[PDB]
Amino acid sequence: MVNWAAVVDDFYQELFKAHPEYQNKFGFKGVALGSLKGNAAYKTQAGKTVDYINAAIGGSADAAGLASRHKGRNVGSAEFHNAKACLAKACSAHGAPDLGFAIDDILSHL
Ligand code: HEM
Numbered sequence: 001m002v003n004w005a006a007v008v009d010d011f012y013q014e015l016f017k018a019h020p021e022y023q024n025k026f027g028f029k030g031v032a033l034g035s036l037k038g039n040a041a042y043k044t045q046a047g048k049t050v051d052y053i054n055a056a057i058g059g060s061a062d063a064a065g066l067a068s069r070h071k072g073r074n075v076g077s078a079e080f081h082n083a084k085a086c087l088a089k090a091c092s093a094h095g096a097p098d099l100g101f102a103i104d105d106i107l108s109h110l
Pocket residue numbers: 022023025026027045048049052053069070073075079080083084087103
């Protein structure tokens with residue numbers, strides 16, 4: 001099956017490399033990017049992100065709910081447009097399908 005866990009790991013490397021300040025909103029704030037895999041808070045976030053991707057593909061994802069929760073952290077359209085770019089890179093590096101359609105669904109509620 002598609003190694004979405006590896007995709008998500010690359011996605012967060014790309015995201016925080018380009019926008020390090022985004023990391024400050026997480027429980028792994030301040031942690032070196034190259035060490036995130038050994039961080040408990042990151043492990044949980046990465047898993048939830050993978051789950052969301054599998055939910056989007058499976059048809060169960062609550063994009064409105066996810067959008068609302070991100071607004072609840074002051075994360076909106078600008079951030080998700082930036083994320084769309086990083087995720088496209090991560091998917092391409094793994095021969096995985098692009099997830100732009102899934103991010104657009106979230107953007108439609110932001
Ligand atoms: C590909 C785009 C993204 C996906 C699929 C995604 C997915 C998720 C998911 C599934 C959760 C957990 C929601 C829950 O527990 O109900 C979450 C939480 C969160 N996301 Fe995102 N996210 C994305 C982009 C971003 C970006 C760009 C930021 C910028 C700061 C961000 C910030 C956060 C924060 C701060 C939380 C809460 C973390 C916590 O509870 O400690 N996300 N995200």
